[PDB]
């Protein structure tokens, strides 16, 4: 399980800080409510698509698993890369997802819990 403060520091290093006008708290909250801080976690979908990465990126549009119908693979990054032990691929594809135009509302966890809330509390006290 990834640490909270360490994940925030790694995300800040990667350059996701102040991406699309969103503080690190929003992203940390979204990841925590998406995969419980697990990059190896996967969830099936009724349509056959499977979420991948710590942020639970959907394969039908972002990563080409080869098992989901109509894979647009916009990120063009293999789902295995998101499944990797590192979080680089997840953040790289999440940058494109958020840059799509609709911001962080695309992810269900972010709208459910991370939207219009004290997201700064998640990163508070991490000495970053």
């Amino acid at each position, epitope marked *: 399980v990834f640490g909270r403060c360490e994940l925030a520091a790694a995300m800040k290093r990667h350059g996701l800080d102040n991406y699309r006008g969103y503080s690190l708290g929003n992203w940390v909250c979204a990841a925590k409510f998406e995969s419980n801080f697990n990059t190896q976690a996967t969830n099936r*979908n009724t*349509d056959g698509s499977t979420d991948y990465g710590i942020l639970q990126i*959907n394969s039908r549009w972002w990563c080409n698993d080869g098992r989901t119908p*109509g894979s*647009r693979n916009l990120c063009n990054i293999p789902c295995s890369a998101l499944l990797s032990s590192d979080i680089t691929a997840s953040v790289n594809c999440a940058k494109k997802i958020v840059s*799509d135009g*609709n911001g962080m509302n695309a992810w*269900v966890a972010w709208r459910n819990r991370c939207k219009g809330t004290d997201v700064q509390a998640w990163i508070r006290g991490c000495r970053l």
Partner: nanobody
Amino acid sequence: DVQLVENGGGCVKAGGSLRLSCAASGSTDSIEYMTWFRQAPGKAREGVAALYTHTGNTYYTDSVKGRFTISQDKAKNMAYLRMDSVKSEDTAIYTCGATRKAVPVRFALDQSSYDYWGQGTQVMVS
């Protein structure tokens, strides 16, 4: 699990104002996109005015650019498409498509991405 029901439509004079109204029921929380697809005779289904329930960003096809306006209400889970400067080409059956997932912007007008459809409503221009 959301079932889409259309309302309005019908006969309207050229240049008149028509208010097509659509509704959602059931597990409407999962509702993400609401779009109108016109099934004109002898023509395949095509998107008209894509919409996002939460952000409210409105995306329109070049044909209906600057003419049709799409808006919705979060509490009443209803999205209605106002029509103005209607012409003969606008004559078609409009279907209130919907999706339970966050489709990309480029595919917002593509029916295949969507998962929910309603009963086609007739639209006439004199």
